[PDB]
Amino acid sequence: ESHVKYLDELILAIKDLNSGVDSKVQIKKVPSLKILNTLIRNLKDQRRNNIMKNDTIFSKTVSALALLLEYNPFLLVMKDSNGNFEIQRLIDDFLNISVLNYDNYHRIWFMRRKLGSWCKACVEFYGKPAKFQLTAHFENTMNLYEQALTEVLLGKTELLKFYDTLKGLYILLYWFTSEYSTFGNSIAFLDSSLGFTKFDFNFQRLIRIVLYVFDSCELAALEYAEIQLKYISLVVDYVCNRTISTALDAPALVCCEQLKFVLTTMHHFLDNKYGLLDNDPTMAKGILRLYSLCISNDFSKCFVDHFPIDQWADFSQSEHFPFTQLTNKALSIVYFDLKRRSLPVEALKYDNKFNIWVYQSEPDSSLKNVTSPFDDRYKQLEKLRLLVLKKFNKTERGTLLKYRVNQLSPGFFQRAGNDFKLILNEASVSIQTCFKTNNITRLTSWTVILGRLACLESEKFSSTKDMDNWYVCHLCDIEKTGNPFVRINPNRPEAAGKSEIFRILHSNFLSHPNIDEFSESLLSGILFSLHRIFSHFQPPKLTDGNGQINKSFKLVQKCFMNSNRYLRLLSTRIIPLFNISDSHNSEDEHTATLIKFLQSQKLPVVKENLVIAWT
Amino acid sequence: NMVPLNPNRIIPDETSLFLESILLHQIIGADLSTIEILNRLKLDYITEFKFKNFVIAKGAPIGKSIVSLLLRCKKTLTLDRFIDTLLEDIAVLIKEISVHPNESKLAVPFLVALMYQIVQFRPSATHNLALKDCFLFICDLIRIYHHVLKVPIHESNMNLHVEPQIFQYELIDYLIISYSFDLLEGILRVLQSHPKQTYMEFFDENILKSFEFVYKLALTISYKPMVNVIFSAVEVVNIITSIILNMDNSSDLKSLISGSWWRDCITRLYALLEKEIKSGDVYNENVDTTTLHMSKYHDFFGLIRNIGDNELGGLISKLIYTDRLQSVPRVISKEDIGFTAPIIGYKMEKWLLKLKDEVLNIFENLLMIYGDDATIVNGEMLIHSSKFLSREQALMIERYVGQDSPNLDLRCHLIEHTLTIIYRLWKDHFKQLREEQIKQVESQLIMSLWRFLVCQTETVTANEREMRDHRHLVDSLHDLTIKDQASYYEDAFEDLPEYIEEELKMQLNKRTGRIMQVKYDEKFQEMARTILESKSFDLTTLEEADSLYISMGL
Amino acid sequence: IIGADLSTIEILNRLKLDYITEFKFKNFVIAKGAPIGKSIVSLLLRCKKTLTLDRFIDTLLEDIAVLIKEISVHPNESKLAVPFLVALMYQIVQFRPSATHNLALKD
Ligand SMILES: [Zn+2]
């Protein structure tokens, strides 16, 4: 409010002490370091009660500190001469603000990922004199919290000290439950990759320890239910992010033992009537996410083993499942889906109210939360529920190019669709009509669709294929070893000779009067599309003799001497496609054309793609 | 203000939970549980077995003898005694099932997987001398099952593929080998979970000798490699170097270690890292030692990770007749296995990129072990890591940017991490870095640095607008990924308050730049700068450095 | 039982039923040549994780009761499982009479 202007001047004061030029990382300790008092002020104006509740002015407050540490890696390793570096004093002070903002998932994710930036790449300047001086300290405060966890058994524990001991344990869990991208190999128990860390078994120890603590304690507090839902949120978040996380298929897990751990953990949670609170979708989210992981894979039997549900039925009540209404609704939906795939589909039928298959229901109703949405702006919840309802329908499978054309031209496939020439008609009428000058993004989407669709045109005569059964390219997107230019075909079809998509390409793109300004984006996209077309297709004659560079070799010259290196290194890639054909490069004349072209660049920055183009 | 205790804390019987987990333990892919498959097993050559009141008759149900032992020792022992009782008893069981000429060893994979489930259930109570005994048992067990990892590179010209096309014995001992190495990995991670004062009970010379033999057996040179057991064998060394780093008395361990063990490991690591990852010939059988290719005839999940598709899953179930007591295997004709989606190839590439990440990771770890110089901190991690960095940058730029596979980001994270592997080797370990070997790699090192020094120009990005067009071009797969995560699998990814999608439109864009090979992070550009510019070695002269500065401008 | 070699569950493992080609009452699927005691121990381990003691008991009581029932009411079926099922059910009942419920006793 009054100090957001102070933060706006403060980021300018940070960028002022950058360097004499724009080149600044400055990893070492220089013998002005006057930003140390500001570094102190970043956290001494933070532990306060008034406007930390506001989101963005707190976000910029911690983000200016993030940019300061981003441009100054020597600030962690400055040797705060008590016994260590200052980063150990940084972590617990950071933890105080995170435990004041323990509950807001945005506020803790935004803090933990920037701490991951502060630890993963900043310690790498020093390593062994500092890596073990902080990866020990993480386990030191971890050991302190799990040590203090045990004296609540003997009952002499406090109340708020109990609370923030549990909460600090929770946040120390949550940091290390992150993905590999946030915390890399900077911390010595996350040193091992392949979904398989030292944090795995130590975490499976400490979660059983806090289960033992929860069975030891006896408290029905509302806030205890609130912090009780947090740990099951953490146990589903620990197993979600270690999945492989593919494009549109369900993200496959890596460790069936970690799966069984989270399943049996939340099952033992629910068995002891744990974690009940009003209007709280958290357990429902966990159940639905894990069932979404275990829809129809091999782990579905593992789900029905290590989380059984059959025994809480009570069919003959409006209160169907006991615990908390929306979570019990989610449980009913999971039970319904399990029953749906257990029963044969002849008993099932789809009612076309929500178009989902449903069996012969009940003598009573008992089917009100099965298919209805149940939410108070619970958007991820109903999308989970609608995926659970929709995935059984055996509908059209998710595909890359089909998702992209549904994103771009919505509702195209209310027709034949997989018929080939009509999507050519739609892309052609778009690339003739629906642009004036504002689609400097949408036309790039159009041409990347054209680049994949030209590959699809090449995939006929490869009389089997279809719109759906083509995720990626069997020639450009997959690759083999050795010389890739043996796999390409000499007598492949021509671009202008056969492919009407290249006729369209030459119509708009290769004849547009403002090739000199498309954009870097649209030049890159037309380079990608031309790359795929001349990969799958023979390029035309580059020169007949009357000047006459064929509007694409012209694009090679335009993007080849370009100011940016990316379009240089992309425009070099389409060059050997010119170097091979029959009936164009049969007697090595396009060969000598490219030779005397490559002999004609003494420009210093074009040496890189020049030499690569030679190779 | 004290929280009240629970007067009837029902501590569950942990050995009952462990026993129940044993009984319902089923591997991923087969129909029956593992115990029940063992119930479907006999052994008609060992006409009687007994070690310690573990009587097995001739046509006896083997898993019935197991569950007799289980229920008997449940009433008697506490948890660790129950564990290592099962460990040594099933170990002796596996032992004399192995050492017999006419005996089929179909029980052995399920016994090994059973024993793995025994070990990994409670590592807190599992005892390290039992780990040592079981560990040495698996090591000499694999030197018993010797000829599996020693099938030759090429067949003869008259090595006919006329054959009964059988797969049952091959499936048996592939599962034996793979589950064995998986168990070695499990032993060492639970031994890692054992505290940082308690390793000398596990470690002696025989540990290192047996693993050194089986490691040379695993990362083979003149034989066809099994990519499965390569994963396990390098993860073992990862756990080894990790606990060497994370103990205080590393001196006793490294004094137990002869440097021959190091320099025999590191050569096979170099020969592994100098292989290639190409999707179109993963599941093809091709030239050796260049293509970690994950052969079709061993394609299942494994005990820790789910490495493939597990095409062999129902074949594990059809290993047995399931209505009969037998020891001979049920039929698998070998070529009935085997065009829909090379996403299988892409995820196998994802595994192999994580593998090469682990290789350079343990290189990093051993450098941090030997901060001081030694026989193996000797400069070849400039050569081999620089060759890897240079090739995975050059044909990255040539082949991958615009190939829209999910593996692009991790493949260009490999170079991002081995840059630091070059970097701290350069800065902190310059003392051994010989004048000859830098000239052995003078081209590729300086060129690999320059491929980051070229990224300080910054004339591609400069905004938000066209960069998201470029991530539509190449990074629509991460768009799919983040829409699935933002729509299902993240608590913080809903009702975004206009500071956190700001972070998104920062980080997706720097990520897709890092894919597009221009605009790396400035710290990585600085780390490439402070080697080439640094006067610790005359990489360039000043009249040769400007010949590279002009190749940006400057 | 006193006199036979194997345990009762283990004898049930040696049992199938090739006339009732499928049985199911409440997720108690028994196939045609399925090992019957294997289906029992599937039920046992499944209801162990879920139910408390009396619910586990009368679950086993009614399930094995329905099992004995349709093994009985069939003309071509041999009823060799039935004595071991009855003795099994007896062992189920008499173990803890304190928790065993009287309506289950009545049924
Ligand atoms: Zn293509």
Query: Which DSSP string do the residues of chain C spell out, in sequence order?
Result: -BTBSS-HHHHHHT---SSS--B-SSS--B-SS--HHHHHHHHHHHHHHH--HHHHHHHHHHHHHHHHHHHHS-SS---THHHHHHHHHHHHHHH-TTT--HHHHH-
Contact, B237 vs B366, CB < 8 A?
A: no
Q: Is the CB of C38 inside 8 Å of chain A's CB atoms?
A: no
Q: If we measure between CA atoms, which residue out of B507, B495, B484 comes closest to residue A105?
A: B495
Closest-CA residue of C relative to A305 is: C46
SS3 A316: coil
- Residue A608 is encoded by which pair of tokens? 């890189």
Residue whose entry in the numeric block shows the structure tokens 């724009």: A22
Burial class of residue A499, CB neighbours in 10 A (0-12, 13-18, 19+): buried
Chains touching chain C through at least 3 C-beta pairs below 8 angstroms are: A, B
Q: If we measure between CA atoms, which residue out of A408, A99, C20 comes closest to residue B479?
A: A408
Residue whose entry in the numeric block shows the structure tokens 């929500």: A354
CB nearest C27 (choices: A267, A271, A310): A310
Please tell me the distance from the alpha carbon of residue A84 to that of residue B456, in angstroms, as a whole number. Answer: 34
SS3 A538: strand
Q: If we measure between CA atoms, which residue out of B336, B470, B14 comes closest to residue A524?
A: B470
Q: Per the CB < 8 Å rule, is A193 touching B498?
A: no
**Phi, psi (deg, nearest 5) at residue B326:** -150, 170
Ligand 1 mean position, distance from CA A529 (Å): 9
Cβ within 8 Å of residue A150, ≥6 positions away: A213
The one-letter amino acid at B484: D
Total residue count of chain B as it appears in this document: 554
Q: If we measure between CA atoms, which residue out of A138, A163, A133, A43 comes closest to residue A93?
A: A43
Ligand 1 mean position, distance from CA B185 (Å): 41
Please tell me the distance from the alpha carbon of residue A259 to that of residue A236, in angstroms, as a whole number. Answer: 9
CB nearest C48 (choices: B20, B36, B61): B20
HSE of A586, CA atoms in CB hemisphere, 13 A: 6
Q: Please tell me what resolution, in angstroms, this structure has.
A: 3.8
Q: Per the CB < 8 Å rule, is C49 touching A308?
A: yes
- b/e burial code for range A83-115 (CB count within 10 A of at least 16 → b): eebbbbebbeebbebbbbbbeeebbbbbbbbbb
Alpha-carbon dihedral angle through residues A570, A573, A579, A583, given to the nearest 10 degrees: -80
Residue whose entry in the numeric block shows the structure tokens 């009054």: A2
Cβ within 8 Å of residue B91, ≥6 positions away: B115, B133, B134, B137
SS3 A287: helix
SS3 B419: helix
Rounded to the nearest angstrom, the minimum Cα separation between A373 and chain C is 29
- Residue B268 is encoded by which pair of tokens? 């096979």
Cβ within 8 Å of residue C14, ≥6 positions away: C6, C35, C37
Burial class of residue B536, CB neighbours in 10 A (0-12, 13-18, 19+): exposed
Neighbour tally for A275: CB within 10 Å: 25
- Residue B529 is encoded by which pair of tokens? 């700068």
- Residue A212 is encoded by which pair of tokens? 């033992």
List C-alpha distances in Å: A36 to A33, A76, A86, A469, B461. 6, 11, 12, 59, 32
- Method by which this entry was solved: cryo-EM
Please tell me the distance from the alpha carbon of residue A519 to that of residue C11, in angstroms, as a whole number. Answer: 79
CA-based torsion, B51, B56, B57, B58: positive or negative: negative
The one-letter amino acid at A476: C
Neighbour tally for B271: CB within 10 Å: 16
- Residue A234 is encoded by which pair of tokens? 């953490």
Ligand 1 mean position, distance from CA A451 (Å): 7
Neighbour tally for A509: CB within 10 Å: 23
Contact, B532 vs B450, CB < 8 A?
A: yes
SS3 B77: coil
Enter the DSSP assignment of A440: T
Q: Per the CB < 8 Å rule, is A73 touching B523?
A: yes
Mutate to test the interface with A, among B247, B301, B306 (most CBs of A within 10 A): B306
Chains touching chain A through at least 3 C-beta pairs below 8 angstroms are: B, C
Please tell me the distance from the alpha carbon of residue B535 to that of residue B529, in angstroms, as a whole number. Answer: 11
Closest-CA residue of B relative to C10 is: B64
Helices (H), B25-158: 34-39, 62-76, 79-98, 107-121, 128-144
Contact, A315 vs A366, CB < 8 A?
A: yes
What value, to the nearest 5°, has the Cα angle with vertex A343 and ends A391 and A293? Answer: 35
Residue whose entry in the numeric block shows the structure tokens 């009240």: B4
Q: If we measure between CA atoms, which residue out of B391, B369, B404 comes closest to residue A247?
A: B404
Contact, A191 vs A185, CB < 8 A?
A: yes
- Residue A217, beta-bridge partner list: B5
Contact, A347 vs A359, CB < 8 A?
A: yes
Ligand 1 mean position, distance from CA A533 (Å): 8
Chains touching chain B through at least 3 C-beta pairs below 8 angstroms are: A, C
What value, to the nearest 5°, has the Cα angle with vertex A399 and ends A398 and A404? Answer: 110
Please tell me the distance from the alpha carbon of residue C78 to that of residue C71, in angstroms, as a whole number. Answer: 8
Taking the mean position of all CA atoms in its chain, how far away is CA B407?
17
List C-alpha distances in Å: A229 to A138, B9, B270. 25, 21, 48
Q: If we measure between CA atoms, which residue out of B219, B232, B149 comes closest to residue B189?
A: B232
Ligand 1 mean position, distance from CA A447 (Å): 13
- Count CB pairs under 8 A between chains B and C: 17
- The maximal CA–CA distance of chain A, rounded, in angstroms, is 96
Q: Give A14-21 contacts, CB < 8 A, sequence gap 24+.
A: A14/A38, A14/A64, A14/A67, A14/A68, A14/A71, A18/A71
CA-based torsion, C82, C83, C86, C89: positive or negative: negative
Q: Per the CB < 8 Å rule, is A310 touching C50?
A: yes
Judging contacts by C-beta atoms under 8 Å, the chain B residues touching residue C10 are: 61, 64
Residue whose entry in the numeric block shows the structure tokens 């026989």: B375
Closest-CA residue of A relative to C51 is: A311
CA-based torsion, A150, A151, A157, A160: positive or negative: negative
Contact, A95 vs A62, CB < 8 A?
A: no
Rounded to the nearest angstrom, the minimum Cα separation between A313 and chain B is 24
Q: Per the CB < 8 Å rule, is A311 touching C50?
A: yes
CA-based torsion, C84, C86, C92, C96: positive or negative: negative
Q: Per the CB < 8 Å rule, is B36 touching C33?
A: no
Ligand 1 mean position, distance from CA A459 (Å): 9
